[PDB]
Design a protein around this ligand. Sequence first.
Ligand SMILES: [Mg+2]
Ligand SMILES: [Mg+2]
Ligand SMILES: [Mg+2]
Ligand SMILES: [Mg+2]
Ligand SMILES: [Mg+2]
Ligand SMILES: [Mg+2]
Ligand SMILES: [Mg+2]
Ligand SMILES: [Mg+2]
Lengths: 388, 388, 388, 388
Amino acid sequence: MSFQPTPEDRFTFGLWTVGWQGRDPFGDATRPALDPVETVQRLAELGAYGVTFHDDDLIPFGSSDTERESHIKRFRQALDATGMTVPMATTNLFTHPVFKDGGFTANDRDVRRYALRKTIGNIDLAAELGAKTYVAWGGREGAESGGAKDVRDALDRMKEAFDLLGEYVTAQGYDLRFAIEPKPNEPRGDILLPTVGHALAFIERLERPELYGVNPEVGHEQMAGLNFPHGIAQALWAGKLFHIDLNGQSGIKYDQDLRFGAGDLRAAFWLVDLLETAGYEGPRHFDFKPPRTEDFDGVWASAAGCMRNYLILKDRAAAFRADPEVQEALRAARLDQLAQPTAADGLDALLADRAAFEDFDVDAAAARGMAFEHLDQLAMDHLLGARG
Amino acid sequence: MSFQPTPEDRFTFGLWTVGWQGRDPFGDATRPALDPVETVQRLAELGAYGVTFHDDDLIPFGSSDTERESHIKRFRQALDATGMTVPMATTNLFTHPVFKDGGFTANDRDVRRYALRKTIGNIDLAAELGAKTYVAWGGREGAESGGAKDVRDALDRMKEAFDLLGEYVTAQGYDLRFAIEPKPNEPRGDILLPTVGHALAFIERLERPELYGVNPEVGHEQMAGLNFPHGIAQALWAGKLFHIDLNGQSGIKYDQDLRFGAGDLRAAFWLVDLLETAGYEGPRHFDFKPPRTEDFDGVWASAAGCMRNYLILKDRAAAFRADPEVQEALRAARLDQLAQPTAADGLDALLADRAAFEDFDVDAAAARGMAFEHLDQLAMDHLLGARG
Amino acid sequence: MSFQPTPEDRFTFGLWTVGWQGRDPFGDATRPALDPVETVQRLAELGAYGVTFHDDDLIPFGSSDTERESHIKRFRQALDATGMTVPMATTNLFTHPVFKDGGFTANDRDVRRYALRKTIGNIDLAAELGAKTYVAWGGREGAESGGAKDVRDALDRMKEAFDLLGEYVTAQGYDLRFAIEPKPNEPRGDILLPTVGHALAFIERLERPELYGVNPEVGHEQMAGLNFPHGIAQALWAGKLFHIDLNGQSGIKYDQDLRFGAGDLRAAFWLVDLLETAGYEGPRHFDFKPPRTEDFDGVWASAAGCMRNYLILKDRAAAFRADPEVQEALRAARLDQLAQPTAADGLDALLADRAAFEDFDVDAAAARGMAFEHLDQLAMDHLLGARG
Amino acid sequence: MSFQPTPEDRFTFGLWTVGWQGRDPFGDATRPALDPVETVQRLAELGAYGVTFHDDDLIPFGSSDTERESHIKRFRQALDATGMTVPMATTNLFTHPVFKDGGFTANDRDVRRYALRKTIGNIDLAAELGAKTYVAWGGREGAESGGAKDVRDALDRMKEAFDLLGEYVTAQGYDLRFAIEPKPNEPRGDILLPTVGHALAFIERLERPELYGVNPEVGHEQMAGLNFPHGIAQALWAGKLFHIDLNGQSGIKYDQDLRFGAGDLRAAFWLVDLLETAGYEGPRHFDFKPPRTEDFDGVWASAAGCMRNYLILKDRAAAFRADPEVQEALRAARLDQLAQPTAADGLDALLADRAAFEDFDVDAAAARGMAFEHLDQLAMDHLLGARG
Ligand SMILES: [Mg+2]
Ligand SMILES: [Mg+2]
Ligand SMILES: [Mg+2]
Ligand SMILES: [Mg+2]
Ligand SMILES: [Mg+2]
Ligand SMILES: [Mg+2]
Ligand SMILES: [Mg+2]
Ligand SMILES: [Mg+2]
């Protein structure tokens, strides 16, 4: 029955999340702004651990440093008031007409110039609040048109931009690191660095890649219809899963930003299972919007569904891997053998074996049925009886 | 008028292309199996340059060392006869039942071990036909609904295969180069290395990344709904586009393999641009399937189609970047500036420079309309003319 | 723990289901044919209720009436042997080159002529085995090309065809009825009557529509990414849900034909819930293929996952609607008011009210938050604690 | 050369078209709000025939009976001034927060009751501007993740609205006609009546189906990945295509609203065919949004684009069905026969007729290649020329 987020399951929420007034393509804000002091108070009280924020979430675009300083101060009084942390921080580069056509990769050069600056102004802040990850999400970087942007030129600029930021952090001797969060489309026709692989492949070209990793969003990859779990496992493979955005989505459509556990449930389980197994140590961060039909408490309800959800799955998959029956389904499915190396020690000398080609009996191997519809149904009950 | 191809087009075809028979996932085969000698011979007439292959396309499954040979002499005699060429070869590791859970990533060690052997057999052939590049498309590497594969182990396994692969290719002085051929799903539910990005990233974890590069299909990225051109741009930036597969696909759906031009017409204009404006010297490989409703010149004409379509598109893009009225418009939207460094000398001291930020007029800049809509119309009247 | 199909939960399987040898686009049958006598024996024993069959599943295409009669006889000996029923029957019109390009709507006229005949030959059989539904699935009816078929002409033929079949049944005084099962694509580019609505809208034009209804497949509608439950509720709305095809799928891709409960779990629950509530009385029919990695028992495992699955969901949704807390979430969500009529008795005289326009307080109504993220999470646990 | 539109094109634009400002789901507004008088005036220059509208497009939300009036005189004075026209009007029932769970299908009876009233207010206007047809696009009618709406009650409710609607329209002698405007998702997660089919079907359950018909968008069916032309064919067969919304969409993704020609170029050729070969006399309504990267002639040119593109496409299809070489090919693939009754006199006695079946040569017929690939190439060289 009653799963309890304890500020140590590392649940953190982007200020923009519960803060979403409900304004959409086709309609008016269905709710009022929340004050970041108010937010922090209330996530603390649900068992949260921290907030994450875009510059503008905190500090409204007009920056009278006076005003500005008395924003951060108000903020910071809550963090200790409540004991909440700010793990991660980002820049808003997609809501001001300026950004119409990107930031790092905008056509005009002072827009690329402004945009770094805007961002360098907040890494610092990211530093001071002791965040340990600085995320970067393209948003206005792609092509609302067609051949309106030469993508290697553009891909040069992405690089230039990232290569300058890493230089600053190095220089200033800051203890952050970056996380490129890719997205297929919405709002630009086609966004640049559109999947965990792209982002991942891109990082390899940067001066110091050891500084850069990814920040995948469940629903973002779902939007190109891909296995998220498979994508995240690649990230982990690369030593690159530096942060995660947990939310729900229902297959290829606009960014929905549903509650976590909502949308694709089986993929939630398979996700969580993995995060629990591959030891992700990071912050179980949530980037969802409680829907706009959904009310002052609706926000929190939706906030909390987020946590009940990682917590049940976390469990159902726990009592899954530990099912003796289940562990004898897995071996039946030769998952132990996947785990063995194909050609070990001293040997590219499978060349000289017969048991491998000349003599190998295909139809023997042919005959052995994979035994996965049975493992699947063990995991479909969440073990036996009960679901998950 | 009509745009006849010639050998210097570098237009290739898989034997499995024009030679597909109709065996869909729900029907029978609508065509007689055509033979190599025949295939090579009409291609040569159509205006084709090379021919590509699979082991099993050429050498029937269980054949002998002699039944092998006679195939190969025969193939070989007709290349010269026609002076056609074989710039690329590939291994079938997905049709036979032993390959039901995969080849390099089977949960069963001696199939893993058998797919390496079968591959080496073919490298050696490909090798001796002067194949310049060696392709590799999984197909059976994924999971229909997994608990069935730890994607972290498979990637261990996947890597090991290729590393083994690159040793032999170098062990053996061949002048060959690997090319991972991504695909999202079908036949698997989820295919490991589903796209260009994942693949590109993957190559960088390999132990000799220079022997790798990527072999994309238009339809295959289209199945994830990516932006093919965009995608090839990222591969031509990585300097990793070793070979391409030209195609037509009408949306996130089963692998169609429509003739090139077919599918996203417009996507196609931008590729020949990219490809033609970018210097791709590789072959224009057509991995398309002539619809099953069609007889032999049914077959013979779609394949013709494939080539007129590169050629008309070659044309119309060529002229796009030569309409004086278009060059105006490339300036207009500042494509020029995309092509200028953002902050060029050492140059992080870009930092106090009061115009980047302090004294920058976002209000002024925001007002700049991108002049994208008129560049897009221009490339529609293919410039100020008759269609693109 | 251990949910028991009792031949009265109406679980029935298409002979082609468990019978699937595993042959796909890219590979060889991974299994042998099962003999329909063998199948029937084995579904009986899992708690099934009946089999459904295409003509050709039973009676292999060459029809020596001698042979043929001694096929049906063999069959029919099992049905009473086991007590299994044949509720539904169909025609295979998509695997013979003949059908390359449709049946009812094929370009050539004797192919449309053959095809009715082929089908009239089996309605009779459908009659004799006492089936009560005769399903029709397009499959080869659509456009692998582009403007290769004039769709109103074609839509005339669909009509002609259906209008002739209904005439026969009327005439012969048979007690069947038809169920058009639509599909978006796979194998023809674009299939005609592609969604429950299309099929539904089409039925209205036929001479006697009272004879015709739909036979939706979960994964078919999923393939156009639509809500199945919403689609089925429309069918029920029309008095047209005449049969159902239960299977799983993972979003927009090729027909997967996964186990029921597999793919989109939340939509399974929402489906089942509804079928259980809207009183569907029909046969909980399954059209799935146990995957080709998946073995002689794998087949049955997968068969049985099908049933464990409708049976748990059937339960979790049972103890959902009956949760007092849940019933006080629903009222909180004004679902009782949806159920009330907007403008009743004698009245289009909302015209004369003020409480409806002139005086109506928007912001009052504006303010009331829908209370659906809370109902959702009740249904996300399956009530409380336990999932579903 | 260049293809100038004129009034007899019957090309319309929504005021919300060229007048969109940029407010995306993640950015601010990139444009000043343009006024009606302005809108009507440049359209008139562009070469436009009519203008369509929403209540709130024209008359600002809470305006008075006088603030109303002055708007209307003003709109009205500029129609004549320019002699433009208003063939269609529509009600905004999706932007204001009172419309957060829907209009006709809100789970709250006095919003339901308020959306009927607001609509009647506008029918009366539309009515007195000589609007020929009255559109209706939900947008807020669906569920983001439902347990939230019984789709059976909503359809009860949905039906009731429209029936009420058709009474007044007839009660009041207006010469108006309803047109349900389908859409799959966005802003809702799932939108009731997601497509042409569902809508078409729906109209037949209404109590005066003749006052209904359908208003499709290219992008909206494209969001379900249907086959737009196909879809419009089904509406022109039902004789239910009252009005169309021309557009560009690049795949199963958020509502783009690209200029017509934009998106599926090729889909577009087949529509003007269909539309032009089929006699649609209705307006060619452009519901497109000028990308936010663009200023006023940014705006002004995409909208120009929309119209040259119908016109070039009009051309190229016209000529398609006039290439003597094409008419050969329509014969070749027997388009002729599709257009002949299958079994024409009374004619079920088609039954013994030994050629339909007994004496039919399936083997002979199967061998007929459909000559689809060459008809498709012909409509590519738009015939034997320069592009389509
Ligand atoms: Mg995010
Ligand atoms: Mg999101
Ligand atoms: Mg390929
Ligand atoms: Mg392909
Ligand atoms: Mg079915
Ligand atoms: Mg299916
Ligand atoms: Mg519209
Ligand atoms: Mg639209």
